[PDB]
């Protein structure tokens, strides 16, 4: 009988990084997206596998909500059936993806005078990540050419790289808050509807 905590996800005080994203499940509520779908407050509302209007008359048993902040030009890697550095090593969306991707500019908060270096991303791994799987490790990956085997030196790098924001950066380098809400159906009765 109570509205779903979609506003809580939208208005989170802080956002997780791409390698440490937080999954918040939605249940035991009903969501009314009519006021926000036409609000035009989101610069990107891609809904792969489902029409935005049609999902109103449907009930989803489980909802997965993910949040992370990336570059303005880095949202290409977040797409079903897409190969990229972020998809391979940070966050992979499976082909059977039925969620709605919502993103908007965050120049007001994420970008500020003095610079922001809190965010991180990963680029070094053995193979690509399995979709909907997140791994956090401090192991220092080493290139096969010169193995240090105990330290981070020549041909040995730490997977994490510091990631920066500042107002003087261009539109392509601007921060963008990205929230993905996935919906699935099961034989169990659905506690979430539209």
């Amino acid at each position, epitope marked *: 009988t109570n509205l779903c905590p979609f506003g809580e996800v939208f208005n989170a005080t802080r956002f997780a990084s791409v390698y440490a994203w937080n999954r918040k499940r939605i249940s035991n509520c009903v969501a009314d997206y009519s006021v926000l779908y036409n609000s035009a407050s989101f610069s990107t509302f891609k809904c792969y596998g489902v029409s935005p209007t049609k999902l109103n008359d449907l009930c989803f048993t489980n909802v997965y909500a993910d949040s992370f902040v990336i570059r303005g030009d880095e949202v290409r890697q977040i797409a079903p059936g897409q190969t990229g550095k972020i998809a391979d090593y940070n966050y992979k969306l499976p082909d059977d993806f039925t969620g709605c991707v919502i993103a908007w500019n965050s120049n007001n908060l994420d970008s500020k005078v003095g*610079g922001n*270096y*809190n965010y*991180l991303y990963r680029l070094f791994r053995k193979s690509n990540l399995k979709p909907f799987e997140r791994d956090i490790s401090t192991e*220092i990956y080493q290139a096969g050419s010169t193995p*240090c085997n*105990g*330290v*981070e*030196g*020549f*041909n*040995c*790098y*730490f997977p*994490l*790289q*510091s*990631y*920066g924001f500042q107002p003087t950066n261009g539109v392509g380098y601007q921060p963008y808050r990205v929230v993905v809400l996935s919906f699935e159906l099961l034989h169990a009765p659905a506690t979430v509807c539209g």
Partner: nanobody, 117 residues
Framework: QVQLVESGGGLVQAGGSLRLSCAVSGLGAHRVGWFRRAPGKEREFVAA????????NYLDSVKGRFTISRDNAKNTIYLQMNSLKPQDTAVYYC????????????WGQGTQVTVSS
């Protein structure tokens, strides 16, 4: 490799936790960690500090973690040199991630300490 000044020099007393400090230019999102060498050798790892201000790597010699400082406004990187190992006297330079990709270079100076008791 324009201007990355450092500081050092001392032979007063060994056995304690005498510190060493330097400074670096505007780094932004750059990882920094000092390196030292050994006689008849080179490229010995010491530590690595991230640009977040919370990511820190420590040597096998130092047990767990020690005191390290980093001021983003002043752009200074500090090192943990506790226990003042008697044989650990060498040249210290505040080299950046020249081996890595998104850090240009730094190999331009070096400081030494020769404290003894």
């Amino acid at each position: 490799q324009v201007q990355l000044v450092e500081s050092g020099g001392g032979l007063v007393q060994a056995g304690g936790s005498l510190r060493l400090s330097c400074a670096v230019s505007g780094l932004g999102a750059h990882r920094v960690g000092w390196f030292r060498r050994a006689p008849g050798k080179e490229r010995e790892f010491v530590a690595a500090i991230g640009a977040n201000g919370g990511n820190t790597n420590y040597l096998d010699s130092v047990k767990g973690r020690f005191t390290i400082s980093r001021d983003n406004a002043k752009n200074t990187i500090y090192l943990q040199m506790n226990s003042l190992k008697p044989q650990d006297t060498a040249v210290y330079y505040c080299a950046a991630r020249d081996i890595e990709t998104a850090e240009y270079t730094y190999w331009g100076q070096g400081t030494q300490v020769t404290v003894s008791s």
